[PDB]
Design a protein around this ligand. Structure first.
Ligand SMILES: [Mg+2]
Ligand SMILES: [Mg+2]
Ligand SMILES: [Mg+2]
Length: 78
RNA sequence: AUCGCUGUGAAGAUGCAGUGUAUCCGCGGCUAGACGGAAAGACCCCGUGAACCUUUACUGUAGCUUUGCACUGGACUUUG
């Protein structure tokens, strides 16, 4: 149904069309901005931003390298 | 123009039949009768009458409750 935008799911893809439940798309993916409903209205806009999709995937996974080095420090004092 | 008796009679007679009694008209009393007056009997039966109650009469329903399909998702699992 929808066109995916994230790859940190457990059965997600890059841009493959998936047939998911109506409750899982209405409630969770779309109101956060992780998917987009496929339709034949603005198809000229998604094909032009395909070069911008590969640059957005090299930033979310690159920020995790400078993030996990401060979470496992175990310096929290209760 | 409103007496008694004994019989008759839609079967308990002031009015019929037979026979005895009795001048015309008040007032004060008493209630035996006029199946006295009041109330289309309430008892009793009837009407393919009417109500309100009862239950284990019949047909249903409020309410309560079981399970499908919606709202409604992922992650692993046992099993057909
Ligand atoms: Mg007589
Ligand atoms: Mg008379
Ligand atoms: Mg009567």
């Amino acid at each position: 149904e929808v066109i995916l935008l994230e790859k940190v799911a457990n059965l997600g893809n890059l841009g493959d069309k998936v047939n998911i439940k109506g409750g899982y798309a209405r409630n969770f993916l779309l109101p956060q901005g992780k998917a987009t409903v496929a339709t034949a209205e603005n198809v000229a806009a998604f094909e032009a931003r395909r070069a911008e999709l590969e640059k957005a995937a090299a930033e979310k996974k690159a920020a995790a390298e400078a993030r996990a080095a401060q979470l496992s420090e175990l310096v929290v004092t209760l």
